[PDB]
Symmetry: C3
Subunit: 129 residues, 3 copies
């Protein structure tokens, strides 16, 4: 076998997507897998990724209620050697669309370069209050 060293700037990302809508369990990990594939295909990017099922604990921003849900940790290693701006923008757009598609108040996105965190973002719904 060949020991192919990955090129590029070593970008990766983690996205956390919950599966409750409010306090109601609603979605499944496979829903997130399929939606992520669909989004990334429309970006023209290699969709390859890992999806980890989790239990998540989250404090709702508006009410302060503490909720426990199933959630998904999406792990993306850039295998295409994208620029920082290209990779970051495509991951941010994916996170923003996942938030909409799953009716989420927040989606958390973490961008890394050689494992060093460049940015952690909370993508937050602007539902009118």
């Amino acid at each position: 076998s060949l020991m192919e060293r990955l090129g590029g700037g070593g970008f990766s990302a983690r996205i956390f997507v919950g599966l409750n809508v409010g306090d109601k369990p609603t979605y499944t990990i496979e829903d997130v897998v399929k939606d992520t594939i669909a989004i990334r295909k429309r970006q023209g990017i290699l969709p390859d990724a890992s999806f980890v099922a989790q239990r998540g604990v989250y404090t709702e921003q508006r009410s302060g209620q503490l909720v426990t849900e199933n959630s998904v940790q999406i792990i993306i290693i850039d295998l295409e050697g994208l620029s920082k701006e290209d990779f970051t923008g495509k991951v941010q757009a994916l996170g923003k669309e996942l938030r909409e598609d799953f009716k989420q108040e927040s989606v958390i996105v973490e961008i890394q370069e050689r494992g060093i965190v460049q940015d952690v973002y909370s993508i937050t719904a602007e539902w009118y209050e």
Copy 2:
């Protein structure tokens, strides 16, 4: 949606908690979720976290027996902008209490700052020998 960049020094932690007591499967991931919520509430800290089910392999320290168990990886991203000392101390106290509550010989704690590991600790029972 709003792309809220997380503030603070970028602290996060990982805690590994096994669910065997010795070679006996005993606990579940939901037990760890509930206990973690309870501990963190008593700390006055936001409990929000992710919990990943795993299979773990561990060599017992006293006997050298190799055990395979279910285990839990707790992932904590600091969203409150705590100081290094505050966050580190609260994570260490959580790990220490989890070790007691689940009758564990070891709990592993990893503290990161912008993804760079600051400390890896094994919290080890002092059972008399």
Copy 3:
């Protein structure tokens, strides 16, 4: 309890192993656990590790087909204080053997030092074309 700070250069690794052979679901996480234990024992290294079940999305290299499979993320924290070369070589050998044992086209290996990625490798089958 004792708060034992881990020594060494802080090496760790992640290995991603799929459970499809081509487009056919074939293996299970427990197969990977058992094979990893067996390999690491023959290396004379402490086998201790964590194994995370995942859903994985992968583009096949030769055909371009997009496949969704179950997969396993192996997380290895070096607790023995190995040298960089020793740890890296033993993780690479484990990844290479896992690729063979599970009839995989690719296995992904990531080596970290204090969380900073030193290398990401794709271990790729040289099946004759």
